[PDB]
From a paper:
Poxviruses are a group of enveloped viruses, the entry of which require the fusion between viral envelop and cell membrane. In poxviruses, however, its fusion process is mediated by a large proteinaceous machinery, which is designated as the entry-fusion complex (EFC). In this study, we reported the crystal structure of the A16/G9 sub-complex from the vaccinia virus.
The final structure, with a resolution of 2.7-Å, was refined to Rwork = 0.243 and Rfree = 0.273, respectively. Within the crystallographic asymmetric unit of the structure, a single A16 protein and one G9 protein are present in a 1:1 binding mode. Traceable electron densities can be observed for A16 residues L7-C291 and G9 amino acids E8-N268. Both A16 and G9 feature with an extended rod-like fold. Sterically, the NTD and CTD of A16 are linked via a relatively long loop, which might be of certain flexibility. Resultantly, the two protein subunits are aligned almost in parallel, leading to good complementarity and the formation of an extended binding interface. Within these three patches, a large number of interface residues are identified for inter-molecule contacts, including G9-residues F92-N93 and T95-H96, and A16-residues D170, T173, R177, K194-P195, S198, D202 and F227 in Patch3, G9-residues D120-H122, R142-N143, H146-Q147, G150-S151, N154, H191-H192, A195 and N197, and A16-residues E166, R193-K194, S198, S201, D223-F227, D229-T230, Y233-V234, Y282-N283 and R290 in Patch4 and G9-residues C243, C248-A251, V253, Y261, L264-G265 and C267-N268, and A16-residues D257-K258, L260-R263, C265-W266, Q287 and C291 in Patch5.
Numbering used by the authors:
A (entry chain B): 8 to 268
B (entry chain A): 7 to 291
The structure:
Amino acid sequence: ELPKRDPPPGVPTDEMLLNVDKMHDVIAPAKLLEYVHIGPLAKDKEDKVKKRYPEFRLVNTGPGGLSALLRQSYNGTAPNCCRTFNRTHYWKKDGKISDKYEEGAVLESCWPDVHDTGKCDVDLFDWCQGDTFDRNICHQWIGSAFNRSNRTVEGQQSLINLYNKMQTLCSKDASVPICESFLHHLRAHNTEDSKEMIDYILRQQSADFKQKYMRCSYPTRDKLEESLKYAEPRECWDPECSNANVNFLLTRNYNNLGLCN
Amino acid sequence: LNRIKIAPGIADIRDKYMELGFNYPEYNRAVKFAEESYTYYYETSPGEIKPKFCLIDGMSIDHCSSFIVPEFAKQYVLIHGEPCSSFKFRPGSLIYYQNEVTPEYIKDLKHATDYIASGQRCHFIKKDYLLGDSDSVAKCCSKTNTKHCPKIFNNNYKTEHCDDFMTGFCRNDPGNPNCLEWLRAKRKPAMSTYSDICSKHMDARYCSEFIRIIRPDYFTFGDTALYVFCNDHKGNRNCWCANYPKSNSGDKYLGPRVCWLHECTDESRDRKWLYYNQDVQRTRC
């Protein structure tokens, strides 16, 4: 009786074949408001996926369980994000953090280009200023803080604020290896303002610092009056300057050392 | 329940008319319906493609997809669509509601018949390639296979999506030219990655290139590597401008003082074995 037609045979698409179980490398690098399509997802799976990817909203895009994850936030922490340039995310399980994905783990994602934003500045200021100093990390941090000069208003204020904070700190004791790196990078900046800041910082140093560290810049008069005799700068011969640590020379002295043969 | 007949359409071959008589004659009808829009290698509307087919509740999703050439299909996602009704016995038929044919009628028929099902019309929308697997990521980012890749993972590393994969890839093949195009974007995980590599293998030519990029702007990432490498390799000749072995002094020829040694005076042009503060002054002399 009825003129029956069976539907034309179904031919799926990639979307339809997608499986979120396989997609951690696809989903982690996604950005805010970018809809990451994940295939049909059954209702009894929604909680697992919401657990795993808590920074994302779970959305139903279409029929038959078709779905997507939409990133909402970066909830990775300064302790785990700021003390490294290595990693943009980590997977968390049982109080432990692992670089590699493990099932049962929850993904946390670091804020992008975070160091250029200055949101790590309060963490590293503490961390690097102690026995918690990691030379490589802590140097890198100051280097790149300077590079925020040509970037963003946020990063330029960052730069400014940190610079103010570091002036006041390093005036107290420029020996602390964090302040050594600061001065090192001012020298690298190599403008009038970076030079006179060094001299400013250096000129506020303590009684012991100057005799322990700046003998080249503060010679004894016996030493000083020999220098007058020669048209070679004092630095080109003075044994106190061949030894000395260049990060604690004043600009004049630092300049002068380059002029010898 | 009698004289079922399929009347041809006037215009759309896909469109048809289903005529029918009934035991109750007040239910008599001439229903317009369409089916099987041809397989599409193109779009119905701006960014849209809507097959002339009603997806009854419970019908397999792929049935919408059967009317799109599979290559052209990879880009498109299937979202929800407006309520439609279909003939159970001929499921996937799109009923058009025109004149005598009216939602009341259809609501009513269902009440009295199992010859009516309902669903949503197939609505496809254009986005980009989906990429649901790790290998799919590796192929796109490394550029060993590029063909079915979205822009986010195939823009010569402009955006950052590939940094996770390239972090591990390039650790293994630092010399890879793509690892170098990646590093040339100067985002912090690349630079950081190469500071680790070159701290171990500074003597490679890729470390030369590493240094060549990061300077002038991100020089610290090279200085860090030089320091550790030369700390870990005191026997290497090329290290002695940066860590000169007099026990009291390895800082001896840093900064201004670099011009003092004849060796460190340009002999070879090899920036990498002198720190930034150092090789600035070399030229200054």
